[PDB]
Design a protein around this ligand. Structure first.
Ligand SMILES: Cc1cc2nc3c(=O)[nH]c(=O)nc-3n(C[C@H](O)[C@H](O)[C@H](O)COP(=O)(O)OP(=O)(O)OC[C@H]3O[C@@H](n4cnc5c(N)ncnc54)[C@H](O)[C@@H]3O)c2cc1C
Ligand SMILES: Cc1cc2nc3c(=O)[nH]c(=O)nc-3n(C[C@H](O)[C@H](O)[C@H](O)COP(=O)(O)OP(=O)(O)OC[C@H]3O[C@@H](n4cnc5c(N)ncnc54)[C@H](O)[C@@H]3O)c2cc1C
Ligand SMILES: N[C@H](CCC(=O)N[C@@H](CS)C(=O)NCC(=O)O)C(=O)O
Ligand SMILES: N[C@H](CCC(=O)N[C@@H](CS)C(=O)NCC(=O)O)C(=O)O
Ligand SMILES: [Au+]
Ligand SMILES: [Au+]
Ligand SMILES: [Au+]
Ligand SMILES: [Au+]
Ligand SMILES: [Au+]
Ligand SMILES: [Au+]
Ligand SMILES: [K+]
Ligand SMILES: [K+]
Lengths: 588, 588
């Protein structure tokens, strides 16, 4: 262990200091490096069990066994006496800047993962470049630094979801004794959009400042890996140039798919366009049944929209199907219409989008049902949410040797390594991994720590918790019921479940037995919780704490002996007793 | 183990059936008992490891080792052939009803704990009586069945807290693009109260129906334990009578304290009166600094009230004091005034409460500061929240021998047993235990299971999570920072912390760095999480899931390797890095 770890650490770290907490010579270097503003990784050997073994192994790299020992890019440079001697002639700055490449790290893609990796790498003194370019949508929509998450993903989505939730809050308020007014109140799409885009703008700038303050070179350019250490860039003026980097992190993310039909690219929009849309969508058709499709359709209906969802087969493919049905049922009972077992054939333009009046055009949607029957209806806006795809053919030359799977995603090892050794991939482009922001963040941060700070900790991709932000939120963590049954057998699976109602909904006169939760369990493994599922308000806030417990290997008994907090929705998980095999109704 | 467990189980259970899942003779009895509607405990011996040992020990009680064996109140009555033989002559009903006392269980107090115990006991066929009486407040306020929680506690408190939160939702809504109107909106106390009391009414009736359906005798009477097995009752007509019970559960709860000063009892109200108060309190003084005091003052200010809190010394004594200060700071920045280091001397009436006009009176509050300076100000309503006390001198004769501590609470063992063997105490009256609803529920349910179903599981009272429902909610689970430091030493405690802001507050233009969370950890125990603390929206929904993890023995590393759900407030617990000893600002 010790031998292998040290070689890899020395060869990969840009600037690293092997040290002990109780040393005046180590402190003299630390104070010098802080004064010269030279960022570095610090390994306190007296804080490690194999610290004494490492010192003897350090002799193979430096000839000495004492501390401190400073290394720059796989090379020993000197001890405390020598480092302070270099600092005396003002030569140390040039030594730590000496490199074979332009950068220790090039990050292609300035999104969640890419920014997390870049910022973390810079902490330990790696010269880092972050490349970001936003290719315009068919209709020319572009945005700033931050990736999908900040600009056209989680952030604007949840803000518009909140705007939708306040519709219900306005209704509830009367029952709770507030004078209004709810029928005489309307929503303004433009007021909301500008507020949301104003917050997006501050994050765009926030990241630009963060990279600057962490001394990370930000380039607004399109990157292309032409060789393992060479990245071709293209700036705003179409200048083509080549930069070199020791390690390459690919974090280019995904973009929405378009079905191969006439009219789609011309007359339809995606989530990329919706969040900055100058006009209110109006009568809207959402083609697709992903979480994006349902979330978007969800708030649009809550913002006084005539919304139809066109579903090819099932809702939320990949998610628990019982839970998916309940998500849809709520939406259908609160305005959202569904065109079941339906696919589109073409979109004909009936009216052109009025730019100078902030109004949508008009589109004729032609499609067909599974049986063969025809679909024909007029919509003001058609939103495609039919999936998301990586576009690595634009990013990656075939000659480089980075292997991609059937879906065009980068095949990685458990430490994010591509088939090219110095090249890594994180985020949505990493095959088989949950496609979520914090996954990209943990991946990026941890990778940067392993590369430049000698860390060993890998990212755990199992039991990653999710929340679908539909009108009624759906939070999950672990396996679906059908997956657990398939993996272990029906006789080994016990499902505890209960309907419930938020206390806030009682006075507000909202429907009983709409909120549902369940625990999927393995009987032969001391009733181990394999999956947690909650449909209700703040389902994300509910699920999070439990994801830690499931990680630790929570059983049903661990839930039972914990005491609930009253009055909350979440406390219901602490007292579940009704099983599915008993057949007793989950109602309260 | 086996020997001792079986004797206790047989002697305590009212109706119990020792059985095996794979037996046609056992099924014949089960179908007979279900048909005759005779409720019973079932012990499946083939589902237990020491099941074979129990069968041999059952011979000492029944002479036989086969199953099924039916026991009634410490006595063997017959096997499958004999039980069906009794059912044939229609004699079985009389055998299972044969008792030395009127009831197998008498529960004194129809609140959270008492109703949980009673309902659970009835499941396993124990003849159960639940006694509840609500002594009128000085001003004559009374309520129905359900205890403090339902009528004058958690339920009406959180509903009025929600009504207060909607004030903020009405403000936020404009920023999120809704047309209003927020300055032209007012709140109506009477509309809210009647809605809240209407929900309280349905719970009052819900419990009456539940006890009936579970065949539990509900008596609206004041109980008094005069001997270990004798309970004296007093009904609505002042009829005095005596009922006998095998086991006695004391669940009489607490009532608010009054300071020993002139005017307090006459002209002041408590939380007992506030939740059904016909008039709006108006300019209000809250005397006290408990969670009740701050919660009440909190929503009253949010409902257009002029609110002052009179504090003797510190806020939320017993809670984390850093967290308590932040709770107060928010309140002070959102309308709530504080009279620091102040105590009351007397309340003089300036104006009598106008009953026929739904308006408060007027009171002169005279008090003094710690230095000696005088306090004098006019208030429309004075609310006392100076603590809560048990009133067991009214409930319990000194001759019975039930030991009480210095604060008048029942001293119990770890299985809720009083100094009298057949007498038990649960809920708020159980000394040293967290005074919360779900604690009373778990205690009651589990006790009933041990008494009448042969269960062994005790209630765990450690690391019970709390949430103070102030304008900004405060959720905690575990030790405070000062307690952890005291118990283990400053050098062994590491505190990770971070300020944060809800995504919903960005567009709504609310203050940055108001929401705060921390993890108190023990360095020498692999950075074990000793205490979790969160100040923010839905702090109860946030904390709950974590309480399970802490129960399992969560470390900081367990939080770190779990992946966050984005965008949520709770996810911030998964990425904490700033320690208090580093001195770096917790701001984002
Ligand atoms: C509508 C919607 C809602 C979502 N909601 C949630 C949610 O609630 N919770 C959650 O966890 N996740 C959510 N996500 C998913 C989440 O946004 C992604 O998983 C996350 O963005 C992954 O980050 P990434 O760095 O891998 O990709 P991105 O954040 O998309 O970053 C990739 C960046 O690289 C850029 N790039 C591409 N090619 C090049 C090139 N060759 N040169 C330079 N730059 C390039 C792209 O323009 C992009 O900015 C949502 C996504 C969508 C679309
Ligand atoms: C303002 C307020 C807010 C609260 N908020 C929360 C919260 O948010 N979360 C939480 O967990 N807890 C909260 N609580 C505390 C919680 O209500 C109690 O811990 C809970 O009620 C304990 O239940 P209990 O059965 O022990 O007592 P109770 O629920 O009070 O039941 C005792 C019952 O016995 C009756 N009784 C008394 N003497 C006799 C007699 N001799 N004969 C017959 N009956 C008798 C009483 O009238 C009462 O109805 C709050 C309390 C208050 C006052
Ligand atoms: N080696 C000298 C001085 C540093 C030194 O004396 N090394 C000590 C640090 S206190 C050391 O590592 N001692 C040997 C050990 O720890 O095993 C230098 O750097 O110029
Ligand atoms: N004992 C008879 C019939 C029941 C019987 O044969 N007992 C079986 C139940 S299948 C038994 O407990 N077998 C012995 C054992 O399990 O060890 C009766 O109840 O009238
Ligand atoms: Au995001
Ligand atoms: Au999609
Ligand atoms: Au709920
Ligand atoms: Au309660
Ligand atoms: Au109190
Ligand atoms: Au927050
Ligand atoms: K599809
Ligand atoms: K006090």
């Amino acid at each position: 262990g010790t031998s292998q770890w040290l070689r890899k650490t020395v060869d990969s770290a840009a600037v690293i200091l092997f040290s002990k907490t109780t040393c005046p010579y180590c402190k003299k270097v630390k104070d010098v490096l802080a004064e010269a503003k030279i960022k570095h990784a610090t390994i306190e050997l007296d804080q490690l069990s194999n610290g004494s073994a490492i010192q003897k192994c350090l002799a193979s790299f430096s000839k000495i066994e004492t501390v401190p020992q400073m290394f720059v890019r796989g090379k020993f440079i000197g001890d405390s006496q020598t480092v302070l001697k270099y600092y005396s002639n003002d030569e140390l700055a040039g030594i730590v800047n000496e490199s074979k490449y332009d950068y220790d790290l090039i990050v292609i893609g300035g999104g969640s993962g890419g920014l997390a990796a870049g910022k973390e790498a810079a902490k330990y003194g790696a010269k880092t470049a972050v490349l970001d370019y936003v290719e315009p949508t068919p209709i020319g929509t572009t945005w700033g630094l931050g990736g999908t998450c900040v600009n056209v993903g989680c952030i604007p989505k949840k803000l518009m979801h909140q705007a939708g939730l306040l519709s219900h809050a306005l209704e509830d308020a009367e029952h709770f004794g507030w004078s209004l007014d709810r029928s005489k109140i309307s929503h303004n799409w433009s007021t909301m959009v500008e507020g949301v885009q104003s917050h997006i703008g501050s994050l765009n700038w926030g990241y630009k400042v963060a990279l600057r303050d962490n001394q990370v070179t930000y380039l607004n350019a399109k990157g292309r890996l032409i060789s393992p250490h060479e990245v071709q860039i293209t700036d705003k003026n179409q200048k083509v140039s080549t930069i070199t980097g020791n390690k390459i992190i690919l974090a280019t993310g995904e973009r929405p798919k378009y079905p191969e039909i006439p009219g789609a690219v011309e007359y339809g929009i995606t989530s990329d366009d919706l969040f900055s849309l100058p006009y209110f969508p109006g009568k809207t058709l959402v083609i697709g049944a992903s979480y994006v499709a349902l979330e978007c359709a969800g708030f649009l209906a809550s913002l006084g929209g005539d919304v139809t969802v066109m579903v090819r087969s099932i809702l939320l493919r990949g998610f628990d199907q019982q839970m998916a049905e309940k998500v849809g049922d709520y939406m259908e009972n609160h305005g959202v219409k569904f065109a079941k077992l339906c696919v589109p054939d073409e979109i004909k333009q009936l009216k052109v989008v009025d730019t100078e009046n902030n109004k949508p055009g008009l589109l004729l949607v032609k499609g067909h049902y599974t049986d063969g029957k025809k679909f024909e209806e007029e919509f003001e806006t058609v939103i495609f949410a039919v999936g998301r795809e990586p576009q690595l053919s634009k990013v990656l030359c075939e000659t480089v040797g980075v292997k991609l799977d059937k879906n065009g995603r980068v095949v990685c090892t458990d430490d994010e390594q591509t088939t090219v050794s110095n090249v890594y991939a994180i985020g949505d482009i990493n095959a088989g991994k949950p496609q979520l922001t914090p996954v990209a963040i943990q991946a990026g941060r941890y990778l940067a720590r392993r590369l430049f700070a000698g860390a060993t900790e890998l990212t755990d991709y199992s039991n990653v918790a999710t929340t679908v932000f539909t009108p009624l939120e759906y939070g999950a963590c672990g396996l679906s019921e059908e997956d657990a049954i398939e993996k272990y057998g029906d006789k080994d699976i016990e499902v505890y479940h209960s309907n419930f109602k938020p206390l806030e909904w009682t006075v507000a006169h909202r429907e009983d037995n709409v909120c549902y939760m369940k625990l999927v369990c393995r009987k032969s493994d001391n009733m181990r919780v394999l999956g947690l599922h909650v449909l209700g308000p703040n389902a994300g806030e509910i699920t999070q704490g439990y994801a830690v417990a499931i990680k630790m290997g929570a059983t049903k008994a661990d839930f039972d002996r914990t005491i609930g907090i009253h009055p909350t929705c979440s406390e219901t998980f602490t007292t579940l007793h009704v099983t599915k095999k008993s057949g007793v109704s989950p109602i309260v």
